């Protein structure tokens, strides 16, 4: 089959730098930061219990709900009980907020509450104050916006206006009402809030309110529960959560679980390795997950992330909502939450509890070892399952907030940090989510850890973060996380993939930020970077150089340190690196090095001239990407020595002379972008300060590598992908066209007078080529490139090459002929350039890349398989541009005065054949040295050798033709000719066929003689026929007269 040939060929000029634009990815409006850190500074516990006497409203049942902060008030006698409940209530709150001024009011007066609240606002000036009101011992709050307290003698219930209560308390405050018709208070609070706003013309969003009940409702009187039901939920969730679990119908599922076993549960609420602390931790994960999935992002960060105590209250409020619901109570919140009671995640809690306290009989009695919950394991498994087919922006994974909770322990930290990296990889959308859920401060805190196992994971996570949000450079320097990464970048055993991410992280931390530059300089970055600059990884070499370049960007201290370490010298090695990214990164750094001189003496000035001349030898460079940065780098040099370049600029209307001459070559660039940027910088000299400084998007474009995914299989390897099937369809179509064309040759080439079409061009046809498989026949002129067809018979496109009026398109090739083809267009002056989307329906002309070769006109020989391209012409040199390395590899001396009129080459057995204007036909082997290169120099002609073409066989035959018009078939291993022929007297242009051995001649006298290699006559078609062109496969022959016409002949 003819498929193995297709798949095994390098596709030149089809990579990231060519296809995509050299431009930085636009950062979206990153709105993940807590743009405030409020704190609940003090707490007011107003307890209206009047322990013993019930108020007139509710007569209580004989058994009844009595427990108040887990104390039976009636056990202790009246007075002691009230102090005790106040003491316990304080303790309960101190679990959540241990560093706040607590201040109890116990069966208070009105004046007593005034002095209490007004004092707490004075202290906690602009920071939050909590007001907790427990009205179990006083009548229910009124519709008229009143809450009851006592008189000093405890003889009368005095009302206290909610208006007056919200006067004394300030703006940032939170209110907790644990009484019967508590909804009324919340309604009346919001009324008086609106009423204050109307009076202010001629404290709403600030004030949070939680209330046990809706206005209609009463609190439950059920003897199993506490009286304090709401306060209990908010302040001791795990205690009521377990007691409530044991009251449901679902206890049947766990025999040997009474209330008595729950009392004696082992552990604490802090120690996550204990049984109680396990549940407390799970609970924190479950509530925080429900909140994140159910609430809008805005309201989540308001309540669950701003401050600890509020976040604890609302996490625990979701439990109150669930529990109290089962007793015809609906808790009420001021910043209203949507109903959470019915979230699936509660089913997870039920199972988690069930499994945890099925063990209690054996843990208490038998003394069995407490097995940890599989909760966290299974939730990470779900998060993992989401990632598999979670490449999209669909519904985000519910488990993001659980992944956060897992990072807090060490037990599951490795696995979570892996998955979190895998998630962050998916795309920049994901990194946005991870930062909004609040992963930032925990990921940053882990940089204080020493566990070496974390280093590859955290490095990955942070590269992904910093790829999206570069502002985090502020945070990493503060906490000395910049040291964490420095250690990783100076570690030989750490893989080169992860060291590259680390070098990027440092290049972001350092980027245009003196605090980070001064910090990394002290952490010895310049020395660390130079040690890794000669690595066998092209990405690491690239980033380490950008990193080196950024650290001394407008920072004279990092430059001096670079001079001592002699960085600029070590960076010259990268200027001759194969990979054009690395060459560019090296040019970037050497430019950034030059720009921050601040007008020093001999030491600094002599270095800049060394760096100038080393950059000035990347003019003749293949990549225009490198040449843009080469301009931008030399821009910094011009800005610094503006006085000197004005002397050089005004003269022509020897250092600075040389650098100005460079910018003239970059000004006259084939590629548009380079010519533009070179012109700007050159014109900002002409009319004579810092305004001239251009910045390339290279370092920003490079940084896009870490926003995009990494871990997953690329699009090309996918066997079932649409790109690969259309590529396989093109390769199937190719193999047919090779077969069908081979069949026409085997029949014996008959007469050849059929004209498929005759069209007329705007310009004179100068050069013609046939696209190998698809019928696209590009017929260029002086400037343009008309793309015709010979099946439909239509004009497909019309370019402008871009070259001036003097110039002429001499040569043309078809790069990547097999698939996704391009069109190389060599100009006579030296300019080579490449075009994509040249005969497409929905697309326009697009110049892929373009670079000055050299400096007959110009000749080229593409070599698809080798990846090379060998320019030659008026000069005495045959360059060999590698297109993979975008550099001139070899410059073979011709050893001839006259112009190289033709140039044809061989793969496998390397043989550069080169005809000459004086008459001679040289052959060169590029393996041996330049002094030796001349294998043969046989001379059997005297004129412009129109075409000395070589065949693709191991039996190579150099078919050379002159202006005098006489073929001489040579061999590579002989000194003289094998065969001889004489064809036309006055020859003008000629073409020779690859597969079959046809020779299509031209004539001054309008003839078109088409003979064989043997010298037999087939045709003499009667009409300066300046262009003939065969197909690579079919025996079709184009012609183009001096008159503005084209033809395409055929052997049926």
């Amino acid at each position: 089959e003819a498929d193995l040939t297709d798949w095994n060929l390098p596709l030149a000029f089809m990579k990231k730098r060519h296809c995509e634009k050299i431009e930085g990815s636009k950062s979206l409006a990153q709105s993940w930061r807590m743009k405030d850190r409020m704190k609940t500074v003090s707490v007011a516990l107003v307890l209206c219990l009047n322990v013993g006497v019930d108020p007139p409203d509710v007569v209580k049942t004989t058994p009844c709900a009595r427990l108040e902060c887990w104390i039976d008030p009636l056990s202790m006698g009246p007075q002691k009980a009230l102090e005790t409940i106040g003491a316990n209530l304080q303790k309960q709150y101190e679990n959540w907020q241990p560093r706040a001024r607590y201040k109890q009011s116990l069966d208070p007066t009105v004046d007593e509450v005034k002095k209490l609240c007004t004092s707490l606002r004075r202290n906690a000036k602009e920071e939050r104050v909590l007001f907790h009101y427990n009205g179990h011992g006083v009548p229910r709050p009124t519709v008229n916006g009143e809450v009851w307290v006592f008189n000093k003698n405890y003889t009368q219930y005095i009302p206290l206006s909610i208006y007056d209560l919200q006067t004394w308390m300030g703006s940032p405050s939170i209110f907790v009402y644990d009484c019967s018709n508590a909804g009324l208070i919340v309604k009346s609070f919001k009324q008086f809030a609106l009423q204050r706003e109307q009076e202010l013309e001629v404290s709403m969003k600030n004030c949070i309110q939680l209330a046990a009940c809706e206005a209609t409702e009463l609190l439950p009187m059920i003897p199993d529960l506490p009286a304090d039901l709401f306060t209990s939920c908010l302040t001791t969730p795990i205690k009521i959560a377990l007691r409530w679990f044991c009251m449901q119908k679902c206890v049947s599922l766990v025999p040997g679980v009474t209330l008595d076993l729950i009392e004696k549960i082992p552990g604490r609420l802090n120690d996550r390795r204990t049984p109680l602390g396990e549940l407390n931790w799970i609970f924190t994960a479950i509530t925080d997950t429900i909140a994140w999935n159910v609430l809008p992002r805005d309201l989540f960060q308001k309540l669950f992330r701003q401050d600890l105590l509020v976040a604890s209250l609302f996490r625990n409020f979701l439990l109150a909502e669930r529990i109290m619901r089962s007793y015809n109570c609906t808790p009420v919140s001021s910043p209203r939450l949507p109903p959470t009671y019915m979230h699936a995640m509660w089913q997870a809690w039920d199972l988690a509890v069930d499994i945890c306290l099925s063990q209690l009989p054996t843990i208490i009695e038998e003394g069995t070892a407490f097995r940890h919950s599989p909760f966290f394991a299974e939730q990470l498994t779900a998060f993992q399952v989401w990632l598999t087919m979670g490449v999209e922006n669909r519904n985000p994974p519910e488990q993001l907030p659980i992944v956060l909770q897992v990072l807090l322990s060490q037990v599951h930290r490795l696995r979570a940090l892996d998955l979190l990296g895998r998630f962050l990889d998916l795309g920049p959308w994901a990194v946005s989510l991870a930062l909004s859920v609040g992963i930032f401060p925990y990921v940053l805190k882990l940089l204080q850890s020493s566990a070496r196992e974390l280093r590859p994971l955290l490095v990955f996570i942070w590269a992904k973060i910093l790829a999206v949000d570069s502002s985090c450079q502020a945070d990493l320097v503060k906490d000395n996380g910049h040291k964490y990464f420095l250690s990783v970048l100076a570690d030989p055993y750490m893989p080169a993939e992860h060291r590259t991410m680390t070098a990027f992280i440092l290049a972001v931390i350092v980027n245009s930020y003196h605090t980070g530059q001064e910090a990394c300089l002290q952490g010895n970055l310049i020395a660390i970077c130079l040690e890794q600059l000669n690595d066998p990884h092209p990405l690491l070499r690239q980033w380490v150089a950008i990193c080196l370049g950024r650290i001394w960007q407008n920072f004279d201290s990092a430059r001096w340190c670079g001079v001592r370490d002699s960085a600029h010298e070590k960076l010259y090695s990268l200027l001759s690196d194969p990979i054009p990214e690395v060459r560019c990164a090296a040019v970037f750094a050497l430019g950034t090095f030059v720009g921050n001189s601040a007008e020093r003496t001999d030491h600094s000035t002599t270095i800049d001239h060394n760096v100038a001349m080393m950059l000035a030898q990347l003019v003749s460079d293949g990549s225009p990407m490198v040449r843009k940065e080469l301009v931008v780098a030399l821009s910094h040099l011009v800005v610094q020595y503006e006085s000197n370049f004005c002397t050089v600029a005004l003269q022509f209307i020897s250092v600075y002379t040389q650098i100005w001459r460079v910018l003239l070559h970059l000004a006259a660039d084939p590629y548009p972008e380079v010519s533009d940027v070179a012109m700007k910088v050159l014109n900002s000299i002409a009319y004579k300060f810092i305004s001239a400084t251009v910045q390339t998007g290279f370092c920003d474009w490079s940084a896009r590598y870490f926003a995009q995914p990494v871990m997953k299989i690329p699009e090309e390897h996918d066997l079932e992908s649409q790109i690969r099937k259309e590529r396989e369809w093109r390769f199937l179509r190719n193999s047919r066209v090779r077969r069908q064309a081979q069949q026409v040759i085997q029949k014996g080439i008959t007469r050849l007078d059929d004209q498929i079409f005759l069209n007329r061009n705007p310009g004179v046809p100068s050069v013609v080529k046939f696209h190998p498989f698809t019928p696209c026949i590009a017929v260029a002129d002086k400037d343009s490139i008309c793309f015709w067809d010979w099946e439909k018979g239509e004009k497909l496109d019309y370019f402008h090459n871009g070259n001036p009026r003097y110039t002429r398109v001499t040569a043309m090739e078809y790069l990547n002929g097999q698939d996704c083809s391009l069109l190389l267009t060599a100009t006579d002056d030296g300019a080579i350039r490449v075009w994509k989307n040249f005969a497409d329906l929905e697309k326009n002309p697009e110049m892929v890349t373009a670079w000055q070769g050299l400096s007959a006109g110009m000749v080229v020989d593409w070599e698809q398989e080798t990846g090379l391209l060998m320019s030659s012409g008026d000069v005495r040199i045959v360059r060999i541009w590698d297109t993979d390395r975008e550099m001139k590899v070899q410059d073979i001396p011709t050893g001839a005065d006259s112009c190289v009129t033709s140039l044809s080459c061989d793969s496998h057995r390397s043989l550069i054949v080169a005809g000459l204007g004086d008459g001679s036909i040289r052959v060169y082997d590029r393996r041996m040295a330049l002094s030796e290169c001349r294998v043969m120099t046989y001379r059997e002609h005297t004129a412009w050798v129109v075409k000395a073409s070589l065949q693709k066989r191991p039996d190579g035959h150099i078919v050379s033709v002159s202006v005098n018009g006489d073929v001489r078939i040579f061999d590579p291993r002989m000194p003289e000719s094998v065969n001889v022929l004489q064809i036309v007297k006055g020859l003008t242009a000629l073409d020779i066929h690859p597969q079959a051995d046809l020779i299509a001649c031209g004539s001054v006298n309008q003839f078109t003689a088409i003979y064989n290699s043997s010298g037999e006559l087939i045709n003499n078609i009667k009409y300066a026929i300046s262009c003939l062109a065969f197909h690579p496969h079919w025996p079709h022959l184009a012609v183009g007269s001096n008159d503005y016409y084209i033809s395409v002949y055929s052997v049926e």
């Binding site: 002290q522 020395a527 001079v563 001592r564 060394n610 001349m613």
Partner: protein
């Protein structure tokens, strides 16, 4: 894949350590050293020398605050795996006693962590001293230092930024770190005897520090090595600045003929003849023919 060698450069604030590093390895000029700022903590220098040797330069900031960190928190990071300790003293210093305490605190840490380390002491800034007192002051400081170095041995040098003394100091350290030094010294002495030279000097390409030598006739100026290093390095920089890169040189008299040319990837060679009526090509042909034999040793 090369021999990595750790070199500590220590001394008080202002003593002239970064000035030394900048001139020898960073193509610095004496005049432009007065602008060098205080190096914060340690500023390392990865110098590629001869391809088989890499110098890990640790330029340690001698600010008393940084000094105490090296003795405490950074004791293991600073003094472990050390090949050479270069200690710098400002000759004009007032706090002589305090200088010795900081020196001895370094030696203690060296004895405890890298007892194998070669110690060099540089009595720096001798240019600030009157010429007639320079010898007296040095021998006096040297004898004290050899004594104060207690168990460990140390080599003392008189240094000044402006002259070649810098080369006297640095050559020894660099010379005593070459992995093939004995081999290198031998191979160059073989080449010299064959080429019939009066003196052959070998220099590292970038720094121009003499890494090996050979002499026939005992020469007058025993400080010529550093002088030639200083002279050609200045020229090298002037060449790249004023036109194009330096490639080769030849000098003559009625008494001598010297040839400076690229030797290996990382070296330069200088061959001096008792200027006989030998044509320049016969000497250059012998240079080219000898390259093929010294190359085998690497």
């Amino acid at each position: 894949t090369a021999m990595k060698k750790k070199v500590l450069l220590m001394g008080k604030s202002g003593s002239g350590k970064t000035s030394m590093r900048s001139i020898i390895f960073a193509n610095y000029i004496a005049r432009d050293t007065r602008r060098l700022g205080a190096t914060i903590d340690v500023e390392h220098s990865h110098v590629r020398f001869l391809g088989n040797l890499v110098l890990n330069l640790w330029d340690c900031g001698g600010l008393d605050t940084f000094m105490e960190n090296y003795f405490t928190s950074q004791r293991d990071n600073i003094f472990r795996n050390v090949e050479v300790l270069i200690y710098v003293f400002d000759v004009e210093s007032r706090e002589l006693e305090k200088d010795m305490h900081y020196y001895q605190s370094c030696l203690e840490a060296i004895l405890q962590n890298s007892p194998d380390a070669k110690i060099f002491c540089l009595v720096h800034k001798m240019d600030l001293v009157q010429e007639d007192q320079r010898d007296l002051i040095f021998k006096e400081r040297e004898e004290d230092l050899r004594r104060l170095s207690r168990p460990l041995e140390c080599a003392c040098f008189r240094t000044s930024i402006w002259d070649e003394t810098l080369y006297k100091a640095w050559s020894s350290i660099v010379y005593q770190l070459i992995p093939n030094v004995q081999q290198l010294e031998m191979n160059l002495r073989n080449f010299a005897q064959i080429i019939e030279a009066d003196e052959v000097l070998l220099f590292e390409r970038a720094t121009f520090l003499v890494i090996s030598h050979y002499q026939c006739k005992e020469q007058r100026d025993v400080h010529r090595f550093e002088k030639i290093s200083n002279i050609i390095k200045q020229f090298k920089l002037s060449c790249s600045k004023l036109a194009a890169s330096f490639q080769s040189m030849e000098v003559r008299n009625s008494n001598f003929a010297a040839f400076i040319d690229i030797f290996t990837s990382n070296t330069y060679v200088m061959v001096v003849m008792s200027d006989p009526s030998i044509p320049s090509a016969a000497t250059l042909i012998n240079i080219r023919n000898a390259r093929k034999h010294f190359e085998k040793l690497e």
